[PDB]
């Protein structure tokens, strides 16, 4: 099982405010979804109401710690761990966050496939300080504007 991060974040490396995104980048979401289809997603419970429903042709994973808690199209898990091990076949695993997820899964992290956005927004959740000498570059491709701001597809592998 290859375990992958996939997030969008800044320079400062914020990813959200009051449960939302701070900014629309259209051309991150066309990657997130060629890149995520067919596989499963794992996500926290605030995650999923972010979006509000199921992503569709993906096997929406929704972490939490309610246990009478049902979420149609979705499969629910106690724990980080739990979801993991039920998932052992699976090639490829995709941790979308949030900010809780994405701590806890770091450690566990072989591939992160980030979107930097080189611009300082406002926030309060960010995603984790990783260590720069665990990871290396694998893919690099930097982006202008027309997607009012400059970006990145940066692809780590440990
Ligand atoms: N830029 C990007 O790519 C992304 C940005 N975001 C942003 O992040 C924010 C949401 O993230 P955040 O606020 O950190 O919330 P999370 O999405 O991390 O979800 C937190 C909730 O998930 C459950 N949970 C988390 N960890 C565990 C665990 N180890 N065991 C059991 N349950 C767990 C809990 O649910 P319960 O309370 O029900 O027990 C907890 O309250 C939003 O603003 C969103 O816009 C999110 C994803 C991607």
């Given at each position: 099982?290859?375990?992958?991060?996939?997030?969008?974040?800044?320079?400062?490396?914020?990813?959200?405010?009051?449960?939302?995104?701070?900014?629309?980048?259209?051309?991150?979401?066309?990657?997130?979804?060629?890149?995520?289809?067919?596989?499963?997603?794992?996500?926290?419970?605030?995650?999923?109401?972010?979006?509000?429903?199921?992503?569709?042709?993906?096997?929406?994973?929704v972490?939490?710690?309610?246990?009478?808690?049902?979420?149609?199209?979705?499969?629910?898990?106690?724990?980080?761990?739990?979801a993991?091990?039920?998932?052992?076949?699976?090639?490829?695993?995709?941790?979308?966050?949030?900010?809780?997820?994405?701590?806890?899964?770091l450690?566990?992290?072989?591939?992160?496939?980030?979107?930097?956005?080189?611009?300082?927004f406002?926030?309060?959740?960010?995603?984790?300080?990783?260590?720069?000498?665990?990871?290396?570059?694998?893919?690099?491709?930097?982006?202008?504007?027309?997607?009012?701001?400059?970006?990145?597809?940066?692809?780590?592998?440990?």
């Amino acid at each position: 099982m290859i375990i992958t991060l996939i997030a969008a974040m800044d320079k400062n490396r914020l990813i959200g405010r009051n449960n939302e995104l701070p900014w629309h980048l259209p051309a991150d979401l066309a990657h997130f979804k060629s890149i995520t289809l067919g596989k499963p997603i794992v996500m926290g419970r605030r995650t999923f109401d972010s979006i509000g429903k199921p992503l569709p042709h993906r096997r929406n994973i929704v972490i939490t710690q309610q246990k009478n808690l049902i979420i149609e199209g979705c499969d629910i898990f106690y724990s980080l761990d739990d979801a993991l091990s039920a998932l052992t076949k699976e090639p490829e695993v995709i941790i979308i966050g949030g900010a809780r997820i994405f701590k806890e899964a770091l450690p566990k992290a072989d591939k992160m496939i980030l979107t930097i956005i080189n611009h300082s927004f406002e926030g309060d959740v960010y995603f984790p300080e990783w260590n720069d000498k665990e990871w290396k570059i694998t893919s690099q491709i930097k982006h202008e504007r027309d997607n009012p701001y400059p970006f990145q597809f940066l692809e780590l592998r440990r």
